[PDB]
Design a protein around this ligand. Structure first.
Ligand SMILES: CC(=O)N[C@@H]1[C@@H](O)[C@H](O)[C@@H](CO)O[C@H]1O
Ligand SMILES: CC(=O)N[C@@H]1[C@@H](O)[C@H](O)[C@@H](CO)O[C@H]1O
Ligand SMILES: *[C@@H]1O[C@H](CO)[C@@H](O)[C@H](O)[C@H]1NC(C)=O
Lengths: 28, 50
């Protein structure tokens, strides 16, 4: 049900952490 | 310019920087190149006058 439209995301956080990633989870 | 809180500088299409966020005071300033113009010289012949 994702609403039809356009809106540009703004960079809010920069993490200089250098971490290797390939998977993720969401916290309800 | 309505510079967003993250934006550091803006450009002319020639890549030359148009405007900058100052690093000591968070003001956003335009950088215009210093004043210039072509110098046409209009003269009679040096046969007639200098
Ligand atoms: C940059 C880096 O370290 N990438 C690794 C990748 O080579 C490896 O195959 C994967 C294993 O899941 O983990 C990540
Ligand atoms: C210094 C010099 O070249 N002067 C000449 C002059 O002798 C000539 O009569 C004139 C013709 O208009 O053009 C000029
Ligand atoms: C640098 O120093 C001035 C004078 O103390 C201060 O007003 C200004 O906020 C400082 N700039 C930054 C980016 O912290």
């Amino acid at each position: 049900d994702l609403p039809q439209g356009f809106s540009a995301l703004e960079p809010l956080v920069d993490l200089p952490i250098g971490i290797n990633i390939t998977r993720f989870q969401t916290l309800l | 310019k309505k510079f967003l809180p993250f934006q550091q500088f803006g450009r002319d299409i020639a890549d030359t920087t148009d405007a900058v966020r100052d690093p000591q005071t968070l003001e956003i300033l335009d950088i215009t190149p210093c004043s210039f113009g072509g110098v046409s010289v209009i003269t009679p012949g040096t046969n007639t006058s200098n």
